């Protein structure tokens, strides 16, 4: 197909985006490089506004945002709530996903602004990278991060109030503490989450909205920064 | 050191554990066979009462039960409750655990038996056992299972009464769904955790007693049977 080819540019472009990136470290440029040398990178343009990628669907590669802004959406069960995380590139797109018995992705990408991303077959990823220690190493240490994060949760501290239990919850479906986060959530099924009801749920929304931490929309709770929120 | 060694018997029983367990399927017995020749295997004999693991400790090596039964033993931060889960033989230690930024063992692990182990090496794993594609697969496939499962929970339709909600407190805490299980807290912590107070969760507690579900003894609470509560 009619292909401009720049290798020296594709490199750099590379060199400032993946090897950035936890699953690349401990690599040198050379080894990096060769490594890539080895799979089909399929990169793609998306619209601002455009899905990237929709949960359900299968997950049979790793896609590497490298340039521009996308939200993260995840939809509780039964979409009782949703909630909208922006990321900026550099990042890798659920890696836990390429494994597993759910094969299938966990959240949708939307494209926020214009994105550049660029794609690898899990087949590649299996037959070529994986033969590799640094890389098997640095995968395996990022999916097990993820589970023991995930395991350490459930045996913290409770909360004592209204409040901290309404951070929590927030923070808790965050991928990271800082940045602009949405939570698309009606009263009645907040309420429900929290086993607590309108009237306090309000209240308590009501004074974190007061000191600037949380705006409130209809059905709609916007955290401009969620790392306020620690 | 003075050894016995039948090499027939000896594979024969690591047919009969190892080969059975997720991280060793697709394997011929032949393969098998030679991936643990590669290796150096400790066989540790525990009495009953004796910590195999202490939470908190450097995990250093795959750790095997081939016989016997085991308790997992969790404490909560500040341990505000601990949990006894049931485990036996045959069964592979906390594989999340020997990667990531915390190397420690998340739980201490109690023979409640007799019990005989394997354990190998960190280095023996990454060295020799990870270098084969099926090995490696089989571990990811474990520790994004488990990531999975913790990441779906968060999502959750939420409990809509107390004795729903305890019942997911005890289930969310157990690596599995069956089995006995013993929750050591006393009742001023075990409100706090549930975000509800003493004499309704007194209440729902002797109704899921009366029921056969759970024994409540001196801050303690029993459940011989956790599928039960599904």
């Known amino acids: 197909s009619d292909k401009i080819h720049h290798h020296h540019h594709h490199m750099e472009t590379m060199f400032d985006t993946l090897l950035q990136l936890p699953l690349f470290q401990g690599l040198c440029h050379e080894d990096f ?79 926020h602004t214009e994105v550049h991303t660029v794609c690898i077959s899990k087949a590649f990823v299996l037959s070529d990278l994986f033969r590799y220690d ?19 949760r459930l045996w913290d501290e409770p909360t004592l109030d209204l409040k901290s239990k309404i951070i929590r919850f927030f923070l808790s479906h965050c991928e990271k503490p800082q940045g602009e986060k949405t939570f698309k959530v009606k009263m009645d099924d907040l309420a429900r989450c929290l086993d607590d009801t309108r009237l306090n749920i309000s209240k308590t929304l009501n004074e974190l909205q007061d000191n600037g931490l949380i705006e409130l929309h209809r059905k709609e709770i916007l955290i401009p920064d969620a790392q306020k929120l620690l």
Chains 1, 2 share one sequence.
């Open 134 to 152: 640094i890389f098997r190493l640095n995968y395996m240490n990022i999916v097990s991060n993820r589970a023991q994060n995930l395991y350490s």
């Open 33 to 111: 490089t060769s490594i890539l040398d080895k799979v089909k990178l399929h990169f793609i343009k998306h619209k601002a506004g455009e899905t990237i990628i929709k949960s359900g669907n299968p997950c049979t590669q790793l896609c590497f945002l490298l340039k521009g802004e996308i939200s993260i959406v995840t939809n509780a069960k039964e979409n009782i709530y949703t909630v909208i995380e922006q990321i900026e590139a550099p990042y890798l797109i659920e890696p836990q996903s390429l494994f597993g018995m759910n094969t299938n992705y966990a959240s949708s990408y939307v494209a």
